[PDB]
Every structure is written in C-alpha cells, then in structure tokens.
Paper text:
The CRL2 E3 ligase consists of a Cullin 2 (CUL2) scaffold in association with a catalytic RING-box protein (RBX1), with the substrate adaptors Elongin B (ELOB) and C (ELOC) at its N-terminal. When associated with the von Hippel–Lindau (VHL) tumour suppressor substrate receptor, the CRL2 complex is the primary regulator of the Hypoxia Inducible Factor 1-α (HIF-1α) transcription factor. Activation of CRL2, in common with other members of the CRL family, involves a cascade of E1, E2 and E3 enzymes, which conjugate the ubiquitin-like protein NEDD8 (N8) to residue K689 on the CUL2 scaffold. CSN5 is responsible for the deneddylase activity of the CSN.
Having determined the structure of the CSN–CRL2~N8 complex, we next sought to detail any conformational differences in the deneddylated CSN–CRL2. To stabilise the formation of a complex between CSN and CRL2, we employed GraFix27 (“Methods”) prior to cryo-EM. We next resolved a cryo-EM map of the CSN–CRL2 to 8.8 Å resolution. Although the resolution of the CSN–CRL2 map is similar to that for CSN–CRL2~N8 holocomplex, we only observed partial density for VHL and CSN4. We then utilised cross-link guided modelling to establish the position of the WHB which lacked clear density, similar to the neddylated holocomplex (“Methods” section). Compared with its structure in the CSN–CRL2~N8, the N-terminal helices of CSN2 are shifted by ~21 Å towards the CUL2 C-terminal domain. This change in CSN2 in the absence of NEDD8, leads to a structural difference in CUL2 which rotates upwards towards the rest of the CSN by 20 Å. The position adopted by CUL2 in the deneddylated holocomplex, places ELOB closer to CSN1, forming a CSN1–ELOB interface. In the absence of NEDD8, CSN6 is dramatically shifted away from its position in the neddylated holocomplex by ~40 Å. CSN6 in the CSN–CRL2 structure has its Ins-2 loop dramatically shifted away from its apo-CSN conformation, pointing upwards to CSN7B.
Residue numbers in the entry:
A (entry chain V): 60 to 209
B (entry chain O): 1 to 298
C (entry chain P): 1 to 105
D (entry chain Q): 1 to 99
Write the structure that this text describes.
C-alpha cells in the first residue's frame, strides 16, 4: 500500500456470505493498492462460506443493478467469521428499488448507450437515467467509512 | 424537446416568477392568485426541462432580488432610528418575502436547484453567495447575500452608535423595544452566511466591537463614579444592581455567549481595581461587622 | 395493514396510505378524517363492496398489497346521506402511452 | 391534523390522493404545501401528465413508504418495473415529485 494505507487487521475468519437477493454477490475489498480485490460471486440465493477478512471494504457488487449495495443493511461488509462462522451472514439487501432508481435500472437494461443520447427523455433526463454504478464506487465509499469523517 | 419546448418554457416561468416575487419582495400579503401563479410557474419550471432554464431562472431571480434590494437601499437613505427600525421592518418583511418566494420556490427547490448544479457544485456556477448571476441555490439565501451589507455598511455606521447610546440609556434614556434592538442586530448578523458558518462573524463585525468596548467603558467608568461618591460599601451594591440591570438589557438584545463573557468581564473590571480597601475594611467588618461589606465582600 | 389506494371523489385521485385492519373509516381518514362523513354514509367501496362500519379495509377487500404500493388501487365514490347509494365512480388511471423507440428493439 | 393526504392530480382533474405519510417522502410536496400555500395546499395539479403515468410515479412514493415501514429491505416488496412507454413521461412526473 502507498503512503495512503489500507486495512491492517487482515485474517481469514469463519464467515458465510448469505446472498439473499436476486443478484450476485461480487465480494470485493479496496486493497493496499487502492484497487478492487474481487472474491467468489454469490449468485442469487448463494450462501457460501468465506475466510472473510476483517476491516475490509467487503462490497458485494450485484450482477443485476450493480448499485451502491447494502449487505446486512450497509454498504460495507466485514467478518468476519469465528471458529464456526455465523453472521457472519452477508445477508444481502436487495434494496427497495425506488422510482428514480428503478427508472435508472430499466434505462440501463433497455436503451442503448448510442440511444442514451437518442433517449426518449430530456437532455437532462439523459443524466437523470444514464447513471451507472461501479465497483470502485463502493470501494471508495467503504474507504471513507474506514476512517471516515466529521 | 418532446413534451414541449425545453428552453423557452423558461419564458412563462420567469413571467410568473417575476410577477409573484415582485408581489413578495418584502411585500406583502401574498395573494392566492399569485399563489396559483407560482403553482403554474413551477409547473412550467418542472416541465421546462432546464439546461440553462434553471440556472437562468434563478439568474433572473437573483437579478430581480438584487434590483429590489438596491431599491430598498434607496430607502435606507432616510432619517435616524425611525428608518433604522423601518429597515428592521424592511428585512422583517423581506426575509418573509424571500421565505414565501421559497414557498413559491420550495417545490421549485425540489425542481431546479437540488440535482446537478451550483447546489451540488459551488465551483461551477459561482461561489456560495448566490452566484455570478447564473445561480442555482435557494432564494432567501439570495435575499441574505444581497441584503447583508446594505444592512452592514451604510446603516450600521450610525445605527451601532445609536445602539450603544440607548443601551447605555439603560441608566436613563432607552433603546427601542428591548427586542427590537435584539431583532435589529439579529437581522444584521443573520447573514452570518446562510449556512451560518459563524454566529459572531457578522455579530463581531456589526456590533460586538462597540459592544465589548462600551461594556468595559460604562462598567469601569461607573465603577470609578461609585468608588468616588457612594460609600464604597454601597459602591458594591450600586455596581451590582447596575451591572445586573444592564445584563438584563444584554438579555434584551442578546448573543448568549458575547454579553455573558464581556459583561461579567467588565464587571470584574469595575470591581477588581480597589485593593487595600479589601483587606482594610475586610478586617473591619470582621471586627465591626457590616453585611454590606460582609455580603458584598463575600 | 397499510392499504395503498386512490379515493377518487369525482376523479379525485388520492394516493394514500390507509389501514387494512382499520375499518371503512380509514377508507378515508382522510376525507372523513377531514370531513367526518361516516363510512356507511359513503359508498367508497372496493368495486361496490358494501362496506359496513363493522368492516375494515381488510373487509373492504383491500390489503397493503391488494390496495398495493407499486400501483395504489382505486376507491369508488358514492357519498350517501345514510346508505342511499350514490353513483359510485370506479376510475382507473388511464391507458399509458407506448414504447419509446425501444423499448427492446 | 395536517390533512393526512395530499392530492397529485393528472390531466383533466384525475386526482390521486397520497397519504401524508407517503407525501412527506417528497420534500417537493412538503415545500409546495408551505410555499405557495394559498394554492398548492396538498394539491399538485400536473394537469397535462396522464393518470396512468402519474399513478406509477405516486405508486413509487407508496412503494417507498412500504419499503421504509418494512425497513429490512424486502418483505414481499415486488420489482419496481417501469415499461419503456412509461419512462418517457414518467421522467417528468418523477422530476416534479423529486424524492
């Protein structure tokens, strides 16, 4: 890690990620290099045991909307599993996909990027519906949560 | 765009906006007709589909608000404290005017400022005052940022002196209505920038320096007077009651940290400058018990 | 249960959060929460479902997912003196417009 | 007892009555009822947007209320589908609603 540092408390812990939404759990940690570390994907309804690593930015990126996602009611996940490994359940909130969020999602699924500019919405409604979430989004959110600050 | 024109829907919106806001710049009773006027105004502002229409909307809003506040600065050129509390009322109704603008602008708050603009990026359309006349932020904010030193510079040159004098007139004479002093300097300091980064920035700048000054001035001056000609046993009690009453006036107008600090400060100023008196009449009342100097000393 | 409805009094769409376990009273408040016209003195039914005051929005046929969130349901309008049925208005939202160019293709 | 309901209205006065509890989720409703309160007194007449569109836009607000009451993300909360046809106009309704 650079002069900018990352998770020091690191170790495999008894965990079981409980993907409890219709979307994939891509477990990721913003590593020492400020870079995403992916982990085995939990398909929809995938309870998979993990040697989960405490303090980590365990963002679980969905394959359905890939949004800012709340495992266990929060963007960040951490073990970390003990001698046996309860939740920890990485219980996956499929969020209650709101009106604007669900519009973003359907505009993701249906209209093309070439047709984002051709979208059947205002020039501003383009940005209102052309947003795309990223793994580095939850990476940076959990990095801020690692210190976070006021 | 598809539903209607997406840049010149601004036209009707600014028509309705100017109409109503001029009805509600520091005046007056906000008639319903204009209420539905702004209902349809933010109607057309929401369906106006603004790339510039929002930045230009609150552009023209800032422009008219600057114009009306310069017109009101044209009205601060009037008499003494008559127009001082006239201008008290000026912002009294003009903060209300910007407020019901903002009630006309509340749904418009949801519409054309809060998504992706000056409201989220202050380094794009201009800094946080209002803007460089392409602003995207709230409207009482506009009134404050255009009203602050209309209050500060021209008016407070004499209004602060009037304040000091009539506050001193707690001893005889009087301030305005004992919150109207408080209300006036709250109007003044309320442009502690509308986020209210400080409570003292404009508080300091506006009154707190003459505030602290004449606090100490009158305090230790009357301390000298009552030391001279009050039978210092009664110097004690006179200074005490006087300080309490003036601190009451410091509850008439009040910055709950300023006047506490400085009032008690300059009371100590009064009372800490009479030295050998202390032990001398101390051991006196120790022997010749006198619960003026007993009570006041203790 | 939080039924999700529109009490259309002459097209008066009222996207509300009423209560299933609550009686026909909530069918409104609220209209009777504001106007205080009793549930049996209003034929705000679930498609002409006779709503006695002993009935609830559950017994109104509505649920939080019958009178559901993702499309709050319709409440007919027939305000009666006591029970003299008024012309009850069952009004859908409308037929929505068509596909953007995609839609899918 | 602040109404307990606000009225989002479509086209030729097709009034959707939205419970206060949902209404408050829109800061825009909360502003409108307080700002031009002589006019928008728990009334938002988008007398041009169509009922079937407005219905979905307000149903989102209800859905949000349900989701919130649920708290734990999903207790039989369905997928908030939005057909392409809706999106076109629903964008404007959604913008006016401005959660």
């Amino acid at each position: 890690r650079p002069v900018l540092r990352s998770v020091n408390s690191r170790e495999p812990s008894q965990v079981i990620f409980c993907n409890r939404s219709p979307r994939v759990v891509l477990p990721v940690w913003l590593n020492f290099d400020g870079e995403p570390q992916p982990y085995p994907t939990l398909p929809p309804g995938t309870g998979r045991r993990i040697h989960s690593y405490r303090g980590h930015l365990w963002l679980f990126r969905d394959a359905g909307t890939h949004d800012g996602l709340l495992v266990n009611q929060t963007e960040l996940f951490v073990p970390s599993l003990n001698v046996d490994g309860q939740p920890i359940f990485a219980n996956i909130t499929l969020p209650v996909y709101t009106l604007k969020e669900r519009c973003l999602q359907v505009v993701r699924s249906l209209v093309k990027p070439e047709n984002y500019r051709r979208l059947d919405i205002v020039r501003s409604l383009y940005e209102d519906l052309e947003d795309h979430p990223n793994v580095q989004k939850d990476l940076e959110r959990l990095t801020q949560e690692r210190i976070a600050a006021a | 765009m598809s539903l209607k024109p997406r840049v010149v829907d601004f036209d009707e919106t600014w028509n309705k906006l100017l109409t109503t806001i001029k009805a509600v710049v520091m005046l007056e009773y906000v008639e319903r007709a204009t209420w539905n006027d702004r209902f349809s105004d933010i109607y057309a502002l929401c369906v106006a589909y603004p790339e510039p229409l929002g930045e230009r909307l609150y552009t023209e809003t800032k422009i008219f608000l600057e114009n009306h506040v310069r017109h009101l600065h044209k009205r601060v050129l009037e008499s003494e404290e008559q127009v001082l509390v006239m201008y008290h009322r000026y912002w009294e109704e003009y903060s209300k005017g910007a407020d019901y603008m903002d009630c006309l602008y509340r749904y418009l708050n949801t519409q054309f400022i809060k998504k992706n603009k000056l409201t989220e990026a202050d380094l794009q359309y201009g800094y946080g005052g209002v803007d460089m006349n392409e602003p995207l932020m709230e409207i009482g904010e506009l009134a404050l940022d255009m009203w602050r030193k209309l209050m500060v510079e021209p008016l407070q040159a004499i209004l602060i002196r009037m304040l000091l004098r009539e506050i001193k007139n707690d001893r005889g004479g009087e301030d305005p209505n004992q919150k109207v002093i408080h209300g006036v300097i709250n109007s003044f300091v309320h442009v502690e920038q509308y986020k209210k980064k400080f409570p003292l920035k404009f508080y300091q700048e506006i009154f707190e320096s003459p505030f602290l000054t004449e606090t100490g001035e009158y305090y230790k001056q009357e301390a000298s007077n009552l030391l001279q000609e009050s039978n210092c046993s009664q110097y004690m009690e006179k200074v005490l009651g006087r300080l309490k009453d003036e601190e009451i006036r410091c509850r008439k107008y009040l910055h709950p940290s300023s006047y506490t600090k400085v009032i008690h400060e300059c009371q100590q100023r009064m009372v800490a400058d009479h030295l050998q008196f202390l032990h001398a009449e101390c051991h006196n009342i120790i022997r010749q018990e006198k619960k003026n100097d007993m009570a006041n000393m203790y | 249960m939080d039924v999700f409805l529109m009490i259309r009094r002459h097209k008066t769409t009222i996207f509300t959060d009423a209560k299933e376990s609550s009686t026909v009273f909530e069918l409104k408040r609220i209209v009777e929460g504001i106007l205080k016209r009793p549930p049996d003195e209003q034929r705000l039914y679930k498609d002409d479902q006779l709503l006695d005051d002993g009935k609830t929005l559950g017994e109104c046929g509505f649920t939080s997912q019958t009178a559901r969130p993702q499309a709050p349901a319709t409440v007919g309008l027939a305000f009666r003196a006591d029970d003299t049925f008024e012309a009850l208005c069952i009004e859908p939202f409308s037929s929505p417009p068509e596909l953007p160019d995609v839609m899918k293709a | 007892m602040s109404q307990d309901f606000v009225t989002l209205v479509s086209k030729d006065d097709k009034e959707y009555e939205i419970s206060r509890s949902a209404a408050m989720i829109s800061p825009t409703l909360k502003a409108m009822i307080e700002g031009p309160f002589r006019e928008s007194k728990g009334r938002i007449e988008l007398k041009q947007f169509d009922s079937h569109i407005l219905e979905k836009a307000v149903e989102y607000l209800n859905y949000n209320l349900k989701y919130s009451g649920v708290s734990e993300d999903d207790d039989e909360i369905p997928e908030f589908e939005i057909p392409t046809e809706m999106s076109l106009e629903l964008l404007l309704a959604a913008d006016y609603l401005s959660i």
